[PDB]
């Protein structure tokens, strides 16, 4: 983007990672948004765990 921290999203739903590139979310998680260049798949990080999640499963704090 280039990739920055600070930017945040909030998990709307539970989401258990479905491949190595992904990360697991719990409803209500505050995740650092690292890459949102893709509209559908966002690179996020929670408690140092990093991966791609469906962008439609979180809300961006903006």
Main-chain phi, psi angles of 5, to 5 degrees? -90, -155
- By what technique were these coordinates determined? X-ray
What domains lie within the chain, and their CATH numbers?
A: 1-62 (2.30.30.40)
Report, in angstroms and rounded to the nearest whole number, the Rg of the chain calculated over CA atoms: 10
**At how many Å resolution was this determined?**
1.9
Query: Which residues, listed in sequence order, are joined to residue 57 by a DSSP beta bridge?
Result: none
2 CB burial (10 A radius; 0-12, 13-18, 19+): exposed
- What secondary structure letter does DSSP report for 21? T
Closest CA to 25 of 33, 7, 13, 8: 13
Whether the Cβ atoms of residue 25 and residue 46 lie closer than 8 Å to each other:
yes
């Amino acid at each position: 983007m280039d990739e920055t921290g600070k930017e945040l999203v909030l998990a709307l739903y539970d989401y258990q990672e479905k491949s190595p590139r992904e990360v697991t979310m719990k409803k209500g998680d505050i995740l650092t948004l690292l890459n949102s260049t893709n509209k559908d798949w966002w690179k996020v990080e929670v408690n140092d765990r990093q991966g791609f999640v469906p962008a439609g499963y979180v809300k961006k704090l903006d």
